[model samples]
Structure formats: structure tokens, C-alpha cells
Target: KPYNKIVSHLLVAEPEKIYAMPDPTVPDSDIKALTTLCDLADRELVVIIGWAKHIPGFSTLSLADQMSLLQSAWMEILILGVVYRSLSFEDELVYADDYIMDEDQSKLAGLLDLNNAILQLVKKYKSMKLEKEEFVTLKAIALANSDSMHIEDVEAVQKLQDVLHEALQDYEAGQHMEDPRRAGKMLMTLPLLRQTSTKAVQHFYNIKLEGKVPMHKLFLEMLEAKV
Candidate 1:
């Protein structure tokens, strides 16, 4: 039954309908060169969450096990975020303007708040009819956000593992994807006309009125090498 559900969800993508028809005359060499460049550019794109395929030992697991492992890792990551909140000052600024009110509070407070928020959101996720991939994407956010490396407690990790298991059950049922972070990354990979490095540089420069270099500094650097 579960396998059927997963299959049904994937069917929504219409395997027969999604086709590639680039001009057959285009040389394979050109296609390879272009695909390679796109892949390289994709590597440069910053994803808030790491791709599922990138996880070690992912391919070796059975599909169900793969899903479970991902869920477990993701939960651990979420708990890590809560744990990491304590390593810094209470008033420490995040992303420039988002400030915490009580950094000194016991780690339990951070744990409770984060856990409740995650649980509440998961409840909301269950209410939505999302597909398997979409469900995985949401869990990926929980994992990606949980990035602290210092805490090594088993009990804390177990809490995340349990929650993820529950969340995955909801996912297996048929919840639609939650948001943009995953979809945005996928869109970034869509192939487009190639632009010369010089053109990319000039284009960015034109977009930046003087002194705006810092905003797209890295992007501009990519152009400089090509130009």
C-alpha cells in the first residue's frame, strides 16, 4: 500500500509527458560542454539544505530505509539548531536584524520552543496533501537547519528521531511540498542559453550602480574569469 502511494504521487509528474527534445543536430560535444557548465554553476548556487542524494550511504539503503534515514538525520539537524542557540550571547544578532530576547535562558527553553514550533508545523504539514518528494523537502529543511556540531547527547538526538518518524508517516500518506527553498534550487538547475563570461560580468556591473559591488561580489568574480 505504501509503495502504491509513492508510485501514485510520482505519477503526478507524468513520466510520459516530461520529455527532452533539444535539436538532434546539436553536437554531443556542445551539449556535454553546456551541461557541464550548468552543473558547475549549480555547484556554486547556495542551497539552504543539502541535496538528499549528497548524504553519505544514501544510495545503499532500501527506498523505505532511505526515507527513514533521511528523516532521522533531518530530525537530528533540527534539534541541533535548538542546541546551538545556546553557544552564543542572548542578544546575538542573526541574519543582521533578527535578535533573540533571552540567550542566557537554560537550553531547555530553547529546546521546548524549537520542538513545539517544529511539531506545530508538522501538524500543519499533515493537514496539507503533499507528495512524497514534497514531504521529503520539508524534512530536509529541518535537517539543514540543524547544523550544530558540538552537542553529542543521545537523548537529544532520539527526540528528533522520534519526531521525524511521525512526520514521515504524514509524508507517506500524501502531503504536498511545503515551500520554495527546495523548488528554488530545482529551478536554478533548469538549463538556459549560455552567456559568455564577459557578458555575465558586464551585465552584473550594469545592474550595480557604483559601490554596489559587495552585493554580488562572488557572482561578479565568476564573470571576471570568463571575461
Candidate 2:
């Protein structure tokens, strides 16, 4: 399936090396960290949108639906990618440039909820001992979700999602001794992913408004960019 092509491009399978975050007490360090994270978010969004447009039958959707899907799923992809990369480490959220954040730091930075949610996700995945194949399949399923508002052809998007759903279930079965519950448990993370992504966006803007960190123009535009 052409889904393989999209997944291949979107998933970075290597274990990410953890990097040290600069001291938050340093005047410039916080800004620098913010820039690094924003830049990463922008780059990831580009790759996600680029691959999504080429997914099999994606281009066939009405323009409204395409944009709708992109808008709805881009943040989810960003958060998922970050969480997946962070799984390479223990008890820390690793950002681009090796900047690492722990739970306490996240709370001090006003992201307590987001941090807790990510921690839970990391814990869940660790418990499952998820493999790369399962991780990528879950990502594809998340992106293919048809529940976003303003979709002109929910049926069409749902068909795409059905394909991904089957793929994920089959992959989980192969990896987990046919534990039927494992697949459902992984799928249940979608709602949490959505909630986390939404909060992440809010956190970004809230900090940006404080004039503490600058947001990349591409990222800002990507937030409202239509497909």
C-alpha cells in the first residue's frame, strides 16, 4: 500500500540521543530552547504535511477535506513524533538539539498537564515494549482518523482509516502473541494524543504572548495553513 511510502517518510526509526537542556536560570537559555523546539515543530509539520499529501487516495479527497484533515492531524503528528523520540530516554522529554526536559521543569514552565499526559503515554508504551513497526502503524492510524469537523467525505477518510486499523491490529497480533486487547489499548491513546497536541499548541501561544520566546512564522502559518 502507498501508506508504506508515507509511513517510511514520516517515521524516524532511530533511537534519539538525549541532549542536555540549558539552565533555565540563564537569561538566554530559555529563549534558545524555545527556538529549538519551535524550529523542530515547524520542520516536523512540513514533513508530515508533505507525506500526507502523497498518501494513496489523499489527493482524491475534496480540497476542503484535505485541508480539514491536515489542520486536524498536524499537531497530533507533531506531539506523537516528539513522544516517540523521547521514548529513547527514561523519564525525560527530549526536544530537538538534544534539549531534555523532566517533569518538574515542565511544570515550572506551565506545562504540567501536557507533561503528565506525555509521561503516561511513555509509560504505557514502555509497558507494551512497543516495537518500531507498531509505533509507526499507530501514527498512521492517528493521522488517518476521520473524526475531524468539516470533512466533506467522512466515508472516504474512514475507508483510509479502516486500512490503517487493520494494519495496526495485524502488526500488534504478530508482535504480542495475539493479545487482542493490546491493539485496542494502543488505539485508545488517540484521544490522549489529541488532547495533548491541543494543549501543546495552547502552551506554545501562551509563552509566545509573554514575549519570552519567538515562534517561527512557518509554524504560525502552519497552524492556520490550509492544504
Candidate 3:
């Protein structure tokens, strides 16, 4: 039952339906930009919370730890989701509302390095040719990490993580007979995901403080959700 409860919520319906950035054609007004960013942030929070709520033992954590884990991991998961969606695009990062950013535009936004890192990840994913099931499983494993400083029951969270880790290894072994290193390579991405997420959080804060773009309430809440 331990595994079943955890596994039951593991499969998110339409995991591909991640956040969509605002439309690029929208007027470039400050208010419009803020609104678009806020809407995207809201959707990202909803999706992150939806995934956490279904995970076994997630709700059992103290309120502070629950918030801590969510605050720490949500951005990483968001980056993962973005990378997943970007695989379909060619040399461009797609945002919500049909806003597409090529390499030069990404550089203009101060995201050239970030975009390059992400693009590299995308290439790795393509090289591995991971399945949808594999991607989702890896996502769950990434989310279950209990290394956040504020978690009250790190051991319990880690136990849950172990289950997901084994699941990913199993999936890789069963699906990719040619490459034994596939699972290890996938696991190696966790640190990169975390590093990129930290940078992104900083970027969001910088924009929010600039007084140009307004941050949505829900987005702010998620940012400060830490204990």
C-alpha cells in the first residue's frame, strides 16, 4: 500500500499541459507584462500544488515543511516542465500566448546562458529519447527531494523519494535496453535543475522590485512560501 498510495497520484493527466507564457503580440505595456507574468506564475503554482497534494506523505508534513518543500522545489519542476515543452520547438523557447523567443531574443532578456543550458538539456533528452512515462517519473523523483533546509521530517520525505528513485531506475532499465547509463544521466540533471531554478527565482525578484512588472498575488505567495 505504501507504493500504491504514492504511485496513485504519480501519473498526472496531461502532464504536457504545463504553464503557457503570455502572448508575444500583446502590447508591450508594463501593466500588460506584469499581468502576463502573474498569470503564468499563478498557473505554475496551481500545477505544482496539484502535484504535491497527490503525493503520498506530502500532506502529512507539518505546514512549515510543506511550504518549505513547495517553495524550494516548485521552480525546479517548472524548469523541467518548460524543457519538456521546448523539445518540440526548433531553436526557440515557447512561452504562453504564442510568445516565441529565439536565441537573440533570449540574449536580450538576459537569459542566453540559461537558455543555452536548457537547450543542452533538451538535446540530452532527445539523445536519450525518453518516453513520456520516463519523463513524468523523473519529475516525481525531482519533486520528492527532501534536502530543503526547513523540512521537519527529512527521513520520511527521503523514504518517499527512494520509492520514486527506484521507479525511475526500473523504468529506464525496462525501456532502454541499449543504454544502462540512461538513468544515471537523467539523475545528473537534478543539480542543474536546482541551479537554474535559483537563478530564475532571482530574476523574478529583480523584475518584481524594478516596479515595471507587477507580480501576481499567488506568484508572490509561492515565492515567499518558505517557513
Candidate 4:
């Protein structure tokens, strides 16, 4: 009950509105589009950090542990948000009301394979027709996984993950008993999700090199972030 309440409140209601991409955007050139995407990311990353801080068990850890986990999983979290928000589109990543990107744009920017990898996940995720509750729950699970990287409070984080892992079964048993394999199917996508997030790191590394928007240092160095 508290779990669902926290997820819904933080993931759904907390963001009353999102930042809009600044103008001077051009879709005709891939680098230009990527610059706009980077600007949007510059804005969205801060919001994700704020949401992540309240992600159930996230704030319970040592301040350092919190930073470690967030730094490690933030890109995955960012991609998860993008996947959720862009689910309505097919063959495109709807970055913002003003910016949409496709393979052609990514290809021009030399990120085609990574771009399609993201698109493919969106396609697969769409097939499941995940609801808001499950989407936020999946995101919670994504951040709490301790095995993804080393953290100072491994045991503590492991316990948090244990609870989350158990939460999935309870969630499925109560809410998705009709589809016995639904939980397994969702977990199956995560390995690919992790793989795709790493590849996305390089893609965004390219985005970082592509250069400035109206925003300041988003520490695009976060792109260099890895387990």
C-alpha cells in the first residue's frame, strides 16, 4: 500500500509539468537535433534526480551510497523515463513537444545502432502495454538493484532489492495472476535494458561532444558513468 502510494505520488504526480526544450532547434541535421536532445536531457536529468531521491528505499542509505547508486543507475533511469514517455510513438523518439527523433537522424549523428536498440525496446515494451503502476514499479526495481555495481552499503541495498524482488511476486500474484509469466517476461527485458543503457552511454558521449545548448554544465560527464 505504501509502496504503491510512494510510486504513484513520486513518479506520477510529482512532475506537474516538465521543462520545455529551448528554441533554435533544427531537425534537418542530426547534430542539431542531438544538441536539442542534450539540452532537454540537461533539464530532465535534474528532475530525474529529484524523483530518484524519493524512490522508496533510495534515501535510506548513506549519503555516499545514495550518490553511488544514483550515479550508476541514473542513465538507466533516464532511459526508462524516455521509454515510458515516448511509448505513444512508433518509429520515433518523441523527445519533447517540439523535438522528435528517428533512425535517420540518429544515423546522421552516427548513433543508428544505439538508436534502434532503444526503439526496439520501446516496440517490445509497447507490446506488453504496461500500465502506469507497473511502469513506475519497474523503475523502482531498476534503481534498487545492488548487484549492478559496488556500493558501500551492499548488505543494506541487497535487502532493499530483496524486498523489491519479493514485491514483484506479490504484485504479480495479486494483480497479474491471469498471466503467470508476466513477471518473468518483465525481468527478462532488464538484461537487455542494462545492455542498451551502456550503449546509450556511448551514444550520449557522442551527444556531449556534439556540444552546447542554452544550458550549463549538466556534467555531461555523467555519460562517462559506468558500473
Candidate 5:
């Protein structure tokens, strides 16, 4: 039910278009490329917030817990969306209808390692043939996690996660009645995403240190948040 709502958030119907790179002759093409990414992130975070509200029981959480969960897991959600967007491409990453990432651009931007890691993750899931419902539910699962954060109502959050877990299990069983491991297989993808999300945090931190892109104030707050 909520899966459809979450999936709909990603349903933009533009024809595939490549990002037109600015003149490579420019002195700081790297800054331009990386700043475009920051802009893309800003746009996506708004959608992510709307999608978060669609999660079952999310609104029921106290306001602080609600904000806390988003602050804690926004990067995970952001990276998940990034991977989801790139799933259609075999050799590149699709950040938006206009902005797709390729190996050369990433290397030029000095993001080769993070780029390779994420591109590989996308291709791996492209093989898994991740379902729409599965991906959205996985997003919900990531948001519900309270293991590391100081949540005021950890037990309630865990219970909500339990509900989501059961939903995924039942959904997988319904879809693949012959395969008992499908749900477990879906859940197994999370650890890799967590690692990627952590790497992304570090990646952004370095970018800030370089003073290339001015971080969006809201995004910067999310980055510095202890929760």
C-alpha cells in the first residue's frame, strides 16, 4: 500500500537526457560538476521528505523522533534513491533525467572510488532485478532503524520496523512462493548500502573541506546532526 505511494515519488516521466557538461576549458570544471551533484541532492531531499511521510506509522512518531530518524538516515535514503535511479543504465549512473554520471566524469571529479563503489552497487541490484515494492519498503526499513541514534521511543520504532519486516516477508512470499530465501536476500542488501552511505558522508565532508560547493544549509545541518 505505502509502497506504491513511495514508488510514485520517483515517477518522473521525462525522456532520458544527458547532462550537458559545461566547457571543459573552464578552470574549475570539477567544482561545476560536483556542485551540480549538490543541487541534485537538494532537489531529491524534498522528495525524500514527502516519501517519508508516506511510510506507515511515520507520522505517528513524535515530532522529534520523526526529525531524528530523517536526520540520522537521510544519506542512506539519498544513496538508495541514487542507486534506484541508475538501475536502468548498464554503464553509467542516472542522477536525474538531465544528470547522468559516467566513469570518466567521476574520475575527473576525483570521485573514482565512491563512484565505482556506487556504480557497482547499482549494477549488482540491476542483476537482482529489485522490485519497486521491495525498494520502497527497504527505504522504510532504513529510516526505521534506531540502533545507533538516540531515539526517544526506540521500542516503538523497533515495533514499526518489525511490522515493515513482516510486510516484506509476506510480500516476497506472495511474489515468489517457490523461493523461501527471497526476503532474506532482499534484506541482505542493506549492509552494503549502509557502507556506501557512510562513505558518502565522508565524501561530502571532503568536498566541504575543499570549499568547492557551498552546502545547502538544511543539508549541512543534517550532516552535522549528532542524531
Candidate 6:
């Protein structure tokens, strides 16, 4: 999940044990259905199967720089009539007690900087690529794999790792750039021929992706930007 305040609030409920916690806003039932779909497609899209079989290869740092990019991809898919499950938590619940407190801001900022650095390294790698298509495909597979959140099928996870490695090999051979995130976002929407075909989980992502303007600008009538 994308660290939404609602999740924090849910955690506050403090189940007596782990499984007792409520089903994820995205239910396990959906996961089962998607997994079945992927299995059915196994022969047709062996690459997807391979990608899912080995998912450890996906890397968050190598995907889009921030949530905004993923959101854009999601909006595109939604616009294309590919509907998936979605939900909302009360906005007040989002800021419930015991969430990202004042003390956590500094640490969170530092983490963001570290993630940004890793993305930069991946970007440098992308700049040296020669065969862009395959290079992009491999990176996207990695992003998908890496973002599985411990919910993906085991074999499919392995495939994700393999394709990611393939992409990295091409990158090392001077066939592609180090820009894995860009590559990842580009290929993310492509249909998976095999592997569990679950809708990408997007509900947990309440984080605003686009950069925020200064408060001063928001206070001014001429700020021009619209929320």
C-alpha cells in the first residue's frame, strides 16, 4: 500500500493478531481472480509468466520518480475503459493519530532524497542505451515485479526478476540507457500475456504526485495553477 493515512488509521484499530486485521481495501478475492486469469494466459504470454515467476527483479527506485508518474499511467488506463477496484477513506481518518508525525517528517525527507539518488543512478544507466524498446520493456517488468508488495505469486515474482536482469544486461552492453523508471512507466500498461492478471493496486496511493507550489503562491489570486 502507498502509506495512506487511512491505512495508518486502520492499523490503529490494533487487531489482536495479524490476520485478524480487516481485508485490504483491495480484497484477497480480487487477487484470487486475477491469479486465475494469469494462469489461464500462461502459454500465450510466457514472457509475462516468466516475469511473474521471478519478481524480485523489480526495483522501486528504477521505476517512475514519484507517485505522480504512476498516477498518470493509471489515469490513462482508466480513461481507456479498463476499470479496476477503487475506494476512499474519510479524509479526517487520513490524518488520524499516530500517522506521519512532526518527528517523522525529517526522516521521511531524507528517505525521499535517498530514493531520488537511486533514481538518478538508474537514469544515468538509461542514457547509454541503443535498443530502446527491449530496454524499456525489461525495466517496466522490473518495476511491476518490485512493487508487488508481497502479494504476487511466487513463480511470477521470479519471472519479474529475470526480465529485469535481462534489461540490465542490455543496459550494461551499451544497448540501452540506465533510465529504468522511464522504461518502467512506459511498459507498465502493456497487457500481461501470462502471470496473475490482477488490476494494479492504486487505492493506497493518496500521496499527491505533482509538485506543490509555495504557500505564498496559493495565497495570491494570480497563482494561475488550479487544484
Model 2 ranges with Cα > 4 A deviation: 1-27, 104-108, 224-227
**Each model's TM-score, in the order given?**
0.22, 0.79, 0.83, 0.84, 0.86, 0.24
Question: Which ten-residue region of model 3 has the weakest summed lDDT?
Answer: 1-10
> Residues 179-220, candidate 2, lDDT per residue (tens digit)?
868879888878878778777777776776677676677787
Candidate 5 lDDT over residue span 1-227, tens digit each: 33333334423321133343444675756788777777667656666777777666888989899888888788888777778878888778777666677888788777788878888788778888987677777888888873546689888898878877887787776677778898898888888888888888888877877886867877777777743
**Candidates' lDDT values, in order?**
0.33, 0.69, 0.69, 0.69, 0.74, 0.29
1-227: candidate 6 lDDT, tens digit per residue? 23323223323422121111222453434233223222222221222223322233333323322222222222222211111110021111111122211223323332233223223333433443323334333334433443433332555446644655455444434423445354344344333311111222221111112222112221121112111
Best candidate (score: TM-score): 5
Against the true structure, candidate 5 has what lDDT? 0.74
- lDDT, residue 173, model 5: 68
Q: Candidate 6 at 110: error in angstroms?
A: 18
lDDT of 6 at 46: 28
The ten-residue window of minimal lDDT in model 2 covers 10-19
Predicted candidate 1 versus true structure: per-residue lDDT over 42-161, tens digit per residue? 232222123444433334435544444433233233222222332233333121122232333213222233333333333333344334454333334343223334334435444544
Model 3 misplaced regions, further than 4 Å: 1-9, 12-26, 29-35, 225-227
On the 0 to 100 scale, the lDDT of residue 215 in model 1 is 38
RMSD of 6: 21.2
Q: Specify the highest-lDDT model's number.
A: 5
Runs off by more than 4 Å, candidate 4: 1-22, 25-28, 146-148, 206-216
The digit string of per-residue lDDT tens for model 3 on 1-227 reads 13333334566543435445566687655456446655776787876776776666677878787777777777777777777767777777655435556787676566677777777777777776756676676677777772687777778788778877777777667667688988788888777777777777777776767767666677887666632
* Residue ranges of candidate 1 with Cα displaced over 4 Å: 1-52, 90-227
Candidate 4 residue-wise lDDT, 11-44, digit = tens: 5634433544635545556556556666677677
Error of 5 at 135 (Å): 1.1
Give every collision pair in model 1.
Answer: 77-146, 90-103, 129-175, 129-176, 130-174, 130-175, 130-176, 131-175
